[PDB]
Amino acid sequence: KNVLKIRRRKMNHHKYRKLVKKTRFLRRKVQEGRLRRKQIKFEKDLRRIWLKAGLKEAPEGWQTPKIYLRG
Amino acid sequence: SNVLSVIIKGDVDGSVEAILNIIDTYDASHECELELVHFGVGDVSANDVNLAETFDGVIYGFNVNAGNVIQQSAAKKGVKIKLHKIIYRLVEDLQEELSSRLKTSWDPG
Amino acid sequence: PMKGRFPIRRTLQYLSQGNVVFKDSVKVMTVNYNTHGELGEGARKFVFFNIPQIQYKNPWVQIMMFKNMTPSPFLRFYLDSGEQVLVDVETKSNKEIMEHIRKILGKNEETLREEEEEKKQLSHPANFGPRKYCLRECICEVEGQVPCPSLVPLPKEMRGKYKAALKA
Amino acid sequence: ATLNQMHRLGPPKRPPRKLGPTEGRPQLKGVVLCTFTRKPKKPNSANRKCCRVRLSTGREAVCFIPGEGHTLQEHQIVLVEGGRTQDLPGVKLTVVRGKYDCGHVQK
RNA sequence: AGUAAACUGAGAGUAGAGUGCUUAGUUGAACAGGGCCCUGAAGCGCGUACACACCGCCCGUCACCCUCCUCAGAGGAGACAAGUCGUAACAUGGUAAGUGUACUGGAAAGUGCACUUGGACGAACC
RNA sequence: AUAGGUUUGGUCCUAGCCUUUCUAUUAGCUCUUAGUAAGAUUACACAUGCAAGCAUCCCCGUUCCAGUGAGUUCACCCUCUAAAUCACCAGAUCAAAAGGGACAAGCAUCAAGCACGCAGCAAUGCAGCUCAAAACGCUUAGCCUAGCCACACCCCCACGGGAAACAGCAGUGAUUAACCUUUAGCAAUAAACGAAAGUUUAACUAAGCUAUACUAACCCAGGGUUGGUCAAUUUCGUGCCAGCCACCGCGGUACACGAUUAACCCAAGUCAAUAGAAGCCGGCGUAAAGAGUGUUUUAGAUCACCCCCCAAUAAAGCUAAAACUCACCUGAGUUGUAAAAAACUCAGUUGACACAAAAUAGACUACGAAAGUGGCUUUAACAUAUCUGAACACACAAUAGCUAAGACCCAAACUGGGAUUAGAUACCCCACUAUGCUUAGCCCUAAACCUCAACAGUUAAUCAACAAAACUGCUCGCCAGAACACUACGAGCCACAGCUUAAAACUCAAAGGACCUGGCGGUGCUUCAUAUCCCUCUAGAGGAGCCUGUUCUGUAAUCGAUAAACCCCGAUCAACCUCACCACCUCUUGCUCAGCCUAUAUACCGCCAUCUUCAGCAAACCCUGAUGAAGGCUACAAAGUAAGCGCAAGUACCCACGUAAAGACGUUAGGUCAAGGUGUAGCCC
Ligand code: FES
Ligand SMILES: [K+]
Ligand SMILES: [Mg+2]
Ligand SMILES: [Mg+2]
Ligand SMILES: [Mg+2]
Ligand SMILES: [Mg+2]
Ligand SMILES: [Mg+2]
Ligand SMILES: [Mg+2]
Ligand SMILES: [Mg+2]
Ligand SMILES: [Mg+2]
Ligand SMILES: [Mg+2]
Ligand SMILES: [Mg+2]
Ligand SMILES: [Mg+2]
Ligand SMILES: [Mg+2]
């Protein structure tokens, strides 16, 4: 069998790698912002949990850790 | 370009025709063009608002109302509704808009 | 072609071919059998062939199977009254098991046909209604009666459009 | 697939037929925003008459104007039905002649 | 091989017109043995994305216009569509092709490591 | 489905798309009558008129009928038992609230919900319950139609608030492609009321409007189509333009476009658009698909009873060959290749010496689940007496890569230099680094492919093609046109230019897999070229002048050939003529029952080049391939036979040699419309 499909996939992959290399910095910024929004959404969901539970403040001795931050 | 798109809404067909004649007496197309998108009888309608939005036009309502729904939609879509109860008041407002597009050389007479 | 050995087992005709309709007291049927052992071949073929028929004919009966739990195959029927019926199915072919269960707990053909006649009692020939429930929709369909206007127009005299005209 | 697999997966599911340019409607009312011509894809060669119209749904689409000659100017109201013009890519509508401001084709 | 070469006539056509053309004749040679890079020919094979048939096909960059998507404007895809720089792929595509991964480069792509044959190694000895 | 059209130079397979059928809405064009049936697009806003009275006052009804489909698993079955009817009760019928069960569609890129349970009389205790057999969550939908559910302007409700309610009938504005009367009577049935005669009722009945449909009639037929699928076109006009098409396609001097003639199909309709009706037992080596590997629970199956060693892996240790380095001493050179440059003064012998890699064995085919494992020794060690079983977890996963520390002989991305090149960010040469190695973590990807899943079984009636013969049973995973897409988003991850899962929008009628023929190959082997491809022999051209042809320049001033296969060629020939060219002048039924050297050699005949300095071309048969395109040979012969044409033979010249002549089918749309004729088109003062 010929390798036309493999060639098409190879060209697409090469172009995608080149694009990611070209715009990595912008992708870095966007991904960091996305992770911040993810952390905020998780915090909001946990707050919804313990508020619907009827508590005005999170359970005593609890502080939502930063699960999405690299550090 | 220096073009004014106008929708005309009147209370009666005679009023609409009179406003149309006043519009046709326009002669200063060179300095600014006047285009009549749609004329009709009745209160400002969603169709009129949509035409105004599409052509960046202004709705001129002669002795017609525009419900709060229409006003809210016009604000949302950037359309401008101008309800006038007097023919010469409306003509003055039209001339002012023409000048804003530019005073307009067209004299209604 | 239909997947599986004996694909006929998955045809509504085969399921309806069953003849074991349990009396109203039977609620649960537990079939214990052994996957191996020549003396349990009858029970094996019973589970493989007839259980579909029994379940189809007695939908509300809970039939539950148990594999290689006891040295012998057997059926146990739990009846509504609280009675338990044990049937030793070792050495019996599946057809023998079907005959036995029909005889000891199956409704008799007399009862079945009487119930069918009772069901026939529901649909009355003389009733007029939609085709789903009655033979005829309207008495217009009976020959000799005044036919439906949509097919045979009524005389001008018998229509209100002209009765009013005459009255005027 | 085995019987157990088919039973687990249930009957096959038809995705909801994606609506065409008419949003699953026989016709739409549009306002002729502009008129122009398009070169059909090769090998066909021509200047197909098309017009950009803002449909009633608020969408802006391109409608091919059939017939020998037209007079569709700006702001005119037309009726537009489905049926893609084969030689034009993306022009997936047609103005219905004789309706609203699009008069029939002159003989 | 009476060939090459040299030399000497005649004819066609014109009123006249060629160093041209056709043709008769004289003298009259040397090599003729090795090979397959190229031209080619044949046989038997191999490959083939070409079928307007390699003057083929086809990739990518760049700028040439519309549809859609993501997007704070810009990118991505597709289509349309003639160009610019190369010839990356299809023949051993002229460095076999490709997968994963890493670095590098207008651009296809190049190279490094391992893996695949969806290449071959011409199928007795030589 | 009784199927058809469509991928290609062609065949076969898969596959999407479309056609044919039947409905419904809208639109274009058109339309005679009668009966019946059905009839806002919108849970947006409403002018107006009516839609609930009855009855000796109380009571009863206005909670019904009627309406709409916003919402939406309250409809169905069982248990119990309200309200209502049975003049009172009777239990009977009917049917609420409550409790138990059943109950739509898609999305898993919604996989965790976060108290969703139990016990106890209570106190209180236990920490449980739902969920990959789809919990929770998002979006969509009135439904299961003698009818049922839900809503009644909105705030789910409706005290309260927003506000002033047609989703009752008629009707209206807005909106949409969507558009029925601002009719009559309670005469019939139903409902309310009354003891009853009776009264009321936009329920209903009878009418009004509408080809939306059915029926019947009509003594006035329109719509669509006519290249194929698919029934059916004459002449003109246009000339890749105008335009047409459901798919394939048509239009460059038209049975596909416009007009006309005719014909075909249906017919008071026709059919443009849209929607719906037909959606899984088929497959996974190459078309999409067996997921890189192994092991569960819940389960499923019947294949369960019948029935030693070699190269696995981890650890520790060791080293034979060859390197490097250092010592000797000897020499001026070494490396580098197709040839060089660059590079080093290091090179050779002998000896000492690794944390690198493991010739021969191996022509063996074993170990491991896969990745992988081939120097030696030792320790430990290679799960399951039944098979399947992870996007649903656990443990592995070559090479590459990151992190931190060591080793570094050699090799080596990148880098630098030397070449080569039009360029050379490559291929070739040199040097060197990350890296390959050891340790501890990460990373979790491969053409992880034997592209062929596990288990059990059969070789019988085969089998699209190729490949590694065809299948049966069972199970799990996966696939449903191409591309967008090893993508974006979402999610998870020690990953930060990443990996796994993974769509959609726009676009197309194909994409694709396997073959057959042809060409092509800087394609292989073998054999040849006989003035032939190279060397070899002779004579030349390429250097000078001239003759002459052509291209260019010039002119008012031809045309044709113009790679081989043009270029002293058409011409075995131009001062006038020839002459078809240019300038000027002149003639118009004209030498011709006109004329035209005007365009078209890409309409042709005619005569030719070309391979051909070939030998094949072949009708008519037969067979092989499963009766596909296609192919058809072996002489100790195996499916070919072939008429005819060509070669050959025959013939001219001086032989039987040689030279001529001859040279088929075709190739270059090869030359000639200017030998002549000739179709088409064009000019006719
Ligand atoms: S159905 Fe009986 S009269 Fe019409
Ligand atoms: K010379
Ligand atoms: Mg691509
Ligand atoms: Mg190449
Ligand atoms: Mg190459
Ligand atoms: Mg490579
Ligand atoms: Mg490099
Ligand atoms: Mg109609
Ligand atoms: Mg709804
Ligand atoms: Mg997503
Ligand atoms: Mg309302
Ligand atoms: Mg409410
Ligand atoms: Mg109403
Ligand atoms: Mg209205």
Ligand SMILES: [Mg+2]
């Ligand atoms: Mg309608």
Ligand SMILES: [Mg+2]
């Ligand atoms: Mg013609």
Ligand SMILES: [Mg+2]
């Ligand atoms: Mg594939």
Ligand SMILES: [Mg+2]
């Ligand atoms: Mg297992």
Ligand SMILES: [Mg+2]
């Ligand atoms: Mg797995």
Ligand SMILES: [Mg+2]
């Ligand atoms: Mg690894």
Ligand SMILES: [Mg+2]
């Ligand atoms: Mg190093």
Ligand SMILES: [Mg+2]
């Ligand atoms: Mg491997």
Ligand SMILES: [Mg+2]
């Ligand atoms: Mg990848």
Ligand SMILES: [Mg+2]
């Ligand atoms: Mg990704």
Ligand SMILES: [Mg+2]
């Ligand atoms: Mg992401």
Ligand SMILES: [Mg+2]
């Ligand atoms: Mg020669």
Ligand SMILES: [Mg+2]
């Ligand atoms: Mg010269």
Ligand SMILES: [Mg+2]
């Ligand atoms: Mg010439």
Ligand SMILES: [Mg+2]
């Ligand atoms: Mg020429």
Ligand SMILES: [Mg+2]
């Ligand atoms: Mg002369």
